[PDB]
Amino acid sequence: LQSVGQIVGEVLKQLTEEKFIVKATNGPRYVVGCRRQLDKSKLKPGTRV
Amino acid sequence: LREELQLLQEQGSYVGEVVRAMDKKKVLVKVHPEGKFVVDVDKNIDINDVTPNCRVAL
Amino acid sequence: CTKIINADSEDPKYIINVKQFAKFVVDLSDQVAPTDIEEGMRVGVDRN
Amino acid sequence: AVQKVVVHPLVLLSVVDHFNRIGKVGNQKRVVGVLLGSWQKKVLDVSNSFAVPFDEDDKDDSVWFLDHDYLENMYGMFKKVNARERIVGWYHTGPKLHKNDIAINELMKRYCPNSVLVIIDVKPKDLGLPTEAYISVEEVHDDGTPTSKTFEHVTSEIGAEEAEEVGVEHLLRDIKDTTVGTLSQRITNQVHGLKGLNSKLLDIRSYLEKVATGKLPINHQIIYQLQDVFNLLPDVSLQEFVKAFYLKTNDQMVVVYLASLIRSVVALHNLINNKIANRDAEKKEG
Amino acid sequence: EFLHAQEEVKRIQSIPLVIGQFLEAVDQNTAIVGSTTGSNYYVRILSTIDRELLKPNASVALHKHSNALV
Amino acid sequence: TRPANHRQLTFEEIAKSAKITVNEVELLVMKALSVGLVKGSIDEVDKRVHMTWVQPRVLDLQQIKGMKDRLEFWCTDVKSMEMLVEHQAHDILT
Amino acid sequence: MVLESTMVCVDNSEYMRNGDFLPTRLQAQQDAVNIVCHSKTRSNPENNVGLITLANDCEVLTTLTPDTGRILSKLHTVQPKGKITFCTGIRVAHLALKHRQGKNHKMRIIAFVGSPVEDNEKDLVKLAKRLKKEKVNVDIINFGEEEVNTEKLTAFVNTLNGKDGTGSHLVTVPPGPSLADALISSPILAG
Amino acid sequence: LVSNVIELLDVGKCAVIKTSTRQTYFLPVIGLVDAEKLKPGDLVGVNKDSYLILETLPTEYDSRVKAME
Amino acid sequence: DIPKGYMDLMPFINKAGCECLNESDEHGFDNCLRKDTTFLESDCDEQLLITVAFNQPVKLYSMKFQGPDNGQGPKYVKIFINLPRSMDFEEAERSEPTQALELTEDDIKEDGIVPLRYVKFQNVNSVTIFVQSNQGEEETTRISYFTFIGTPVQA
Amino acid sequence: APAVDTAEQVYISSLALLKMLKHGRAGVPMEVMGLMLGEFVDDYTVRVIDVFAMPQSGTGVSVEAVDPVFQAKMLDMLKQTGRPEMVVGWYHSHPGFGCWLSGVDINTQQSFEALSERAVAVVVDPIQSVKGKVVIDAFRLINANMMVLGHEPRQTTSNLGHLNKPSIQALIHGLNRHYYSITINYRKNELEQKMLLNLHKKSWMEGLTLQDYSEHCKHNESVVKEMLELAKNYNKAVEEEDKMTPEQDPKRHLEEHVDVLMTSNIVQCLAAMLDTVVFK
Amino acid sequence: SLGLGLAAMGTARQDVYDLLKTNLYQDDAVTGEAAGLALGLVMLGSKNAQAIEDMVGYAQETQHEKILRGLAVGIALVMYGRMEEADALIESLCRDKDPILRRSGMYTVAMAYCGSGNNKAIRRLLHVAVSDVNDDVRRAAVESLGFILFRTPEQCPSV
Ligand SMILES: [Zn+2]
Structure with a gap:
């Protein structure tokens, strides 16, 4: 009950080491940062997130 | 910088196509995708300057 | 309103499709008896 | 156990408010409360706390009351409001540790096995002492020495999550801050660093004086x-x-x-x- | 105070930001932008943005709660 | 016995003090480094040993007083130079 | 009939390791506190009761609560594996009473001593003077060891009951038939 | 709120669903139901705010299979 | 009596919080409370500690702390407020009061009203009076009448 | 008839604001609520000394979300601790909805005001409270008879009540028609501010730690190369200045790079040599 | 209280001062403004140690901000026209943590050095106006410049 669920989208681009252009499915697109502990190397464009 | 900071915290205005200036105080305008409303005009904007099918801000 | 989900006075929920909006599984208001509600009739519902 | 204790700038405010609130008439000069927070087998952060009705007597510094049932009831309320935070340890002001700390810690050990004491100094905030965290350990005194309890110091940090950094920032924004470090503030930081080094050196020298004259016993690891x-x-x-x-x-x-x-x-x-x-x-x- | 104001302006460019299309420049500081949420907004352009980089249909990041062309 | 003023000690000092031949000083320092007592190095060409060792001992209260005096020197240097920096930068510290 | 908050003082010292009562001296004091708490609660439904141990430290296992069941449960699992320390126990109990909920409750504690109190008479008399200063009706009951109602306890009560004081009745229990009726004849009638 | 469970992934299982507000939604924990049958297409009732599968409800239809009674 | 715009705070006194330390059993706490010749007498020594709580928060202006003429009326009074816990004589002597009061002789008479620092008594929930000494330096002190003049904060 | 002055303020303590923000965020996207304790000092002051959260209920934020047992027991045990402050008002979070009072919010506020005429209903947007600005407002109400009779809701005696302008979002949701905004001031004494200062008070150490010398050299190289390109641009632009009557600047960027270079290298040099001479 | 202070302005009579101090001690927000202002008016330009200590102590003891403003203007008035004899008080008010007391310090600079044009007072006022963290104090600091410089109006727009 403490989980809130999450959007799902596809990473479009790596704007910089922190800013990721990410498109939500059937919705708008954002620039969003990643979690503090994550494998940015595996955040290739097109990777569903 | 402070003025820009202040004005940058106010919400954006919807653009809309005015269907027609109904009255001297009311204007029928269609804004995508909410639909069509009959808005009022603030003090600065003159009604006679409002012409049909012109993009206005709400 | 859509399938009755076989209420039998213990599961009175029905899934209803609000037009181009979503569909929700909901329950009745106290003012309507289940006999008045059946699959495929237009029903007016609250918003939350 | 724990190699770091992270104290959010809300238990700091909670402690300060508790201290002022008591010390309106409460001249015991030292108040005791319980600090909750998310637990980790790694760096432990604390995010909330409450204050228990505590009493202490200066006689023999072994007669004292901490309302454990009040502790339980407040913890029940806080769990109902936010079950994510569990009892992490206990805090008390009065930067001079009294004798009850380990004993009281024992009482806290039942509500939290790795109960960490966190002295949150209120008045003295000169250079670098926002808070000091201690954890009781099970060793007599050393390889070849008699028995004791010997609280161990743990590195403590002050850190805030989002929607709490904003409150701190808003309460701040006096002539202070200026996160961009210009040259003047950097040189000021150098001066502050020299001051801190000198203060630490003077503390060490005072300890060496108290040891050389025999006032203090020799600590071998020191x-x-x-x-x-x-x-x-x-x-x-x-x-x-x-x-x-x-x-x-x-x-x-x-x-x-x-x-x-x-x-x-x-x-x-x-x-x-x-x-x-x-x-x-x-x-x-x- | 100028340092603090610059810090605040830079902070307004934080994340997340919604992507939109720079439809049309209206004034030196205000534009019309089509946010990919599917909606056209009359918003205010941030000064530090390079004006020559503002071309029609260019992708622009807008403030989440104000749609200001960030 | 050498408080880092002259950390380089020649093999003659070890040979005379430890009453050993200068051929075995290599093996002696060899063993000392191996067992973890000291962390220096050996310059055999000039017959010296650099010493950065981390094995402390009990401190002989007179020795504690001497170390306290050394700390007094250190702290007075730091204080004097904090005063210097503050006086020089008084314009910009504000 | 009288509003009151009582800090019963159970003993779990190693001198409770006795068979003066048939099963166990500790068990005898256990049902003693049981019956005394029942009597106090049923006598006045809004009275307060709390529990204080005295072995090698004075734990405060149960504080002032009108409930009896929880104090009874805490009384079990007591494990008399310590040594008594009377002065600190009464100090803790007195300040615990100082933390009482209702201020109209007359202060009173129940103390079960079953070991010879190792102390000095001076600290006992000064503590009795302090307790009388705060208007606290300490009630002391001697158990276990044969030096029943030692001169220490006598002086403590008498100084505390200076010229018909609170009623710190120094009841004596026989080393043998420490039955409940013998544990309630004197106190319920008069502490 | 009704939703079509798009599929189930491994992390001890997670899900991704498509709610009737034309929105895909990833759930680290699959609500308050079992997690074995859970067909990729199994219509479910997922909470309207915290978006976890509160219940499973019977399938709607397969178009033409309704066309024949 | 009492100054215009104020009232006696007797009906606002909560008996559940009232508690007097070092009182003789024959001379009850209600004797000082009541406006009778009956008096409250300390039993152990001259020091006394009386805590009075109120149903609702109240603001004090003046106190009528009066006793007999035999010198056993109070002379030094430490007033504390909003005490979260019962007060101890040792701490009360040590603690800094909300207001110290050197009761002159004229206060003890029947017409004796002692003004208080109204600034510090704006959120009084419970007020504790520590009588440290008496005029005649006897072994005990008597209080013929004690009360409080003030107004409710209208909670 | 007495009228509430427009100069009345709500003095929120630092602790109260922090607890309110933390609780409001912790419940996102739900709307959380709790009770604000304090005191009505006078007719022009409402002091919020502390605020305790309340357990989340499926009802949402209503007068049925205040569990009487929770409130009573929390108040009693806080009074035991030493916080015997009355329930001044209530607070709840409108996440992303701005600061205003809905119909049910107005309803619960009527309930609270029945307890005491002075009672505020502060609300806080926890997701609009991005670092820097804090989106929070406090409204009481307007009596319907007061408004229908034509009299203004609040008497005015100073400019204090009009230093800040009302928001459009609040105004459409009934501001100045059913509820009025009350100015909010934050009671931050010296002690609390100094305690909060420790959040980013760096250390006595980082004033003395040199930058990674290889990293320092690399940063110097990169900035000097950028400054070279900027100098080329500056020369090119200045050559145009001649053949141009009064009619991004390669200069301003140049000045910024120069300032960052001098501050970095001056600091690094001074720190290095202070280190050389304080550490033997 | 306002009317009495206006009537007794500068007379420094002890009876009116006692009555107004009693009203101030009654500690009401509405009457506090008038009581403090009238304390200033009655004991105006008197440099009285007793009145000033009573008023500053009350300003540091009470909790109603209206009383704080009234007492601020009162403290200013008490030290009117005393020039450097105010300096001690001025410092004791410039360093105070309460922003209303700092505003009182600025008003005291104005009343003490009214018309003298003393450059030390102007320096302090400008420093506060450009440095202080509370906007009301900055405002009052700028206001006090008029009282300082009214004897040389030509120099006033320049600053
Ligand atoms: Zn709401």
């Missing part, structure tokens, strides 16, 4: 670490490190010369534009 520090001091003689001159001169060029030249040339150009614009206006005055 002396061992003093020897380690004294040996760790580098040497600015030995003309191989003196070739650090090299990089200092290297620093100079990029800074100093180049930057100055550019700054000086830009200022001179700005003077040309003004000395032109002024004569333009004067000639127009025609």
Whole structure:
């Protein structure tokens, strides 16, 4: 009950080491940062997130 | 910088196509995708300057 | 309103499709008896 | 166990409010409360706390009351509001540890096996003492010494999550802050660092005085670490490190010369534009 | 105070930001932008943005809660 | 016995003090480094040993007083130079 | 009939390791506190009761609560594996009473001593003077060891009951038939 | 709120669903139901705010299979 | 009596919080409370500590702390407020009061009203009076009448 | 008839604001609520000394979300601790909805005001409270008879009540028609501010730690190369200045790079040599 | 209280001062403004140690901000026209943590050096106006410049 669920989208681009252009499915697109502990190397464009 | 900071915290205005200036105080305008409303005009904007099918801000 | 989900006075929920909006599984208001509600009739519902 | 205790700037405010609230008439000078927070087998952060009705007697410093049932009831309320936080340890002001700390810690050990004490100093906030965290350990005193309890110091940090950093920032924004570190604030930071080093050195020297005259017993690991520090001091003689001159001169060029030249040339150009614009206006005055 | 104001302006460019299309420039500081949420907004352009980089249909990041062309 | 003023000690000092031949000083320092007592290095060409060792001991209250005096020197240097920096930068510290 | 908050003082010292009562001296004091708490609660339904141990430290296992069941449960699992420390126990109990919920409750504690109190008479008399200063009706009951109602306890009560004081009745229990009726004849009638 | 469970992934299982507000939604924990049958297409009732599968409800239809009674 | 715009705070006194330390059993706490010749007498020594709580928060202006003429009326009074816990004589002597009061002789008479620092008594929930000494330096002190003049904060 | 002055303020303590923000965020996207304790000092002051959260209920934020047992027991045990402050008002979070009072919010506020005429209903947007600005407002109400009779809701005697302008979002949701905004001031004494200062008070150490010398050299190289390109641009632009009557600047960027270079290298040099001479 | 202070302005009579101090001690927000202002008016330009200590102590003891403003203007008035004799008080008010007391310090600079044009007072006022963290104090600091400089109006727009 403490989980809130999450959007799902596809990473479009790596704007910089922190800013990721990410498109939500059937919705708008954002620039969003990643979690503090994550494998940015595996955040290739097109990777569903 | 402070003025820009202040004005940058106010919400954006919807653009809309005015269907027609109904009255001297009311204007029928269609804004995508909410639909069509009959808005009022603030003090600065003159009604006679409002012409049909012109993009206005709400 | 859509399938009755076989209420039998213990599961009175029905899934209803609000037009181009979503569909929700909901329950009745106290003012309507289940006999008045059946699959495929237009029903007016609250918003939350 | 725990190698770090992170204290959010809300248990700090909670402690300060508790201290003022009691000390309106509560001249025990030292108040005790319970601090909750998310637990980790790694760095532990604390995010909330409450204050239990505590009493202490200066006689023998062993007679005291901490309302454990009140502790349980507040913890029940906080769990109902936010079950994510569990009891992590207990705090008390009065930066001088009394005798009950370990004993009281024992009482806290039943509600939290790895109960950490966190002294949150209120009044003295001169240089670097926001909070100090201790954890009880099970060893007599050393390899060859009698029994004791011997709270161990743990590194403590102050950190906030989002929607709590915003409150701190908003309460701040006096003439303070300026997160961008300009040269003046950096030199001020150097001065503050020298002050802190001098203060720590004076504390160590006071301890060595209290040991040399026999007021304090010899702590062997203290002396061992003093020897380690004294040996760790580098040497600015030995003309191989003196070739650090090299990089200092290297620093100079990029800074100093180049930057100055550019700054000086830009200022001179700005003077040309003004000395032109002024004569333009004067000639127009025609 | 100038340092603090610059810090605040830079902070307004934080994340997340919604992507939109720079439909049309209206004034030196205000534009019309089509946010990919599917909606056209009359918003205010941040000064530090390079004006020559503002071309029609260019992708622009807008403030999440104000749609200001960040 | 050498408080880092002259960390380089020649093999003659070890040979005479430890009453050993200068051929075995290599093995002696060898063993000392191996067992973890000391962390220096050996310059055999000039017959010296650099010493950065981390094995402390009990401190002989007179020795504690001497170390306290050394700390007094250190703290007075730091204080004098904090005063210097503050006086020089008084314009910009504000 | 009288509003009151009582801090019963159970003993779990190693001198409770006795068979003076048939099963166990500790068990005898256990049902003693049981019956005394029942009597106090049923006598006045809004009275307060709390529990204090005295072995090697004075734990405060149960504070002032009108409930009896929880104090009874805490009384079990007591494990008399310590040594008594009377002065600190009464100090803790007194300040615990100082933390009482209702201020109209007359202060009173129930203390079960079953070991010879190792102390000095001076600290006992000064503590009795302090307790009388705060108007606290300490009630002391001697158990276990044969030096029943020692001169220490006598002086403590008498100084505390200075000229018909609170009623710190120094009841004596026989080393043998420490039955409940013998544990309630004197106190319920008069502490 | 009704939703079509798009599929189930491994992390001890997670899900991704498509709610009737034309929105895909990833759930680290699959609500308050079992997690074995859970067909990729199994219509479910997922909470309207915290978006976890509160219940499973019977399938709607397969178009033409309704066309024949 | 009492100054215009104020009232006696007797009806606002909560008996559940009232508690007097060092009182003789024959001379009850209600004797000082009541406006009778009956008096409250300390039993152990001259020091006394009386805590009075109120149903609702109240603001105090003046106190009528009066006793007999035999010198056993109070002379030094430390007033504390909003005490979360019962007060101890040792701490009360040690603690800094909300207001210290050197009761002159004229206060003890029947017409004796002692003004209080109204600033510090704006959120009084419970007020504790520590009588440290008496005029005649007897072994005990008597209080013929004690009360409080003030107004409710209208909670 | 007495009228509430427009100069009345709500003095929120630092602790109250922090607890309110933390609880409001912790419940996102739900709307959380709790009770604000304090005191009505006078007719022009409402002091919020502390605020305790309340357990989340499926009802949402209503007068049925205040569990009487929770409130009573929390108040009693806080009074035991030493916080015997009355329930001044209530707070709840409108996440992303701005600061205003809905119909049910107005309803619960009527309930609270029945307890005491002075009672505020502060609300906080926890997701609009991005670092820097804090989106929070406090409204009481307007009596319907007061408004229908034509009299203004609040008497005015100073400019204090009009230093800040009302928001459009609040105004459409009934501001100045059913509820009025009350100015909010934050009571931050010296002690609390100094305690909060420790959040980013760096250390006595980082004033003395040199930058990674290889990293320092690399940063110097990169900035000097950028400054070279900027100098080329500056020369090119200045050549245009001549053949151009009064009619991004390669200069301003140049000045910024110069300033960052001098501050970095001056600091590094001074720190290095202070280190050389304080550490033997 | 306002009317009495206006009537007794500068007379420094002890009876009126006692009555107004009693009203101030009654500690009401509405009457506090008038009581503090009238304390200033009655004991105006008197430099009285007793009145000033009573008023500053009350300003540091009470919790109603209206009383704080009234007492601020009162403290200013008490030290009117005393020039450097105010300096001690001025410092004791410039350093105070309460922003209303700092505003009182600015008003005291104005009343003490009214018309003298004393450059030390102007320096302090400008420093506060450009440095202080509370906007009301900055405002009052700028206001006090008029009282300082009214004897040389030509120099006033320049600053
Ligand atoms: Zn709401």
